[PDB]
Amino acid sequence: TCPFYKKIPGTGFTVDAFQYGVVEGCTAYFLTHFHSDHYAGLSKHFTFPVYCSEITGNLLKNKLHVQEQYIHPLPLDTECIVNGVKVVLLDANHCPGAVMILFYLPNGTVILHTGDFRADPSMERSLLADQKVHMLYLDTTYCSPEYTFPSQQEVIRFAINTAFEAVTLNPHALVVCGTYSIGKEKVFLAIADVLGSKVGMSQEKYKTLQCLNIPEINSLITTDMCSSLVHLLPMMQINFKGLQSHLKKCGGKYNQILAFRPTGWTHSNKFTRIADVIPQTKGNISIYGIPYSEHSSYLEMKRFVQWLKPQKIIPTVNVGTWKSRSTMEKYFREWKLEAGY
């Protein structure tokens, strides 16, 4: 049964609610982004209308084989009418195709559902600026002040400079980057660009990337691993055993691996600056954990909410424990009292 925080009151609508069978009363199912916890339940047999971005719709059709007649893509930043209700999709600054959804209820209430997002000041000048929001369904993944991490730009600068240094010292070093979902493509694209290489990957991953409308992509990626010195592998293979085995397959072309695991937050964030990060090393293999986040830090989240001034906040992440829920409610009250709404 569908939980309350996936239902939009006063509408026939649900958000990210595909694993509950036929939801009673639901006339349109929205999907914020193509990550498995959110799409769980969709397949070629789904026969209700699915509303989403163009990029999410490319992925539904090509990866999950959802039939085209049930996919309803909407343009961003554009007032659209769905089953008699005005909606807008806004960029969530998460993975490719990820959106926030603004719903203009028939009774005058305005609701923003952030999906998964990384808040940014740039959102304070979208169509959110123009009216009041009464209810906020909020991505609270890192809603505690211990969650700090650098900007995406600082992290990419670190990775570029690290990869370029190592491969200029040793032209026989291979760079490997871990992946398990869409998102974080800038990591491996920026490294391949500094090295003058395409990114090599499996057919399945190349297919996924060909759905994302990235400009000039045919210029940046390939399935020919032998032509490439930046390879992508499954995240589960980014360990000493998995990397040793990969280096064997490369046929004496390389004699060293430098590998990257983009994680979200890890507790080495509470002590160490990005400039100071060091790898784990065994023999000719080094592994860097880099804190490239596609979710809001605590400070970014706070700033967005204090700017928006919602009347009510409904968390959509960390909702399963009373200690989490109680923590989050305390922070929302602090924020409200400090800013005065």
Ligand code: NI
């Ligand atoms: Ni996500």
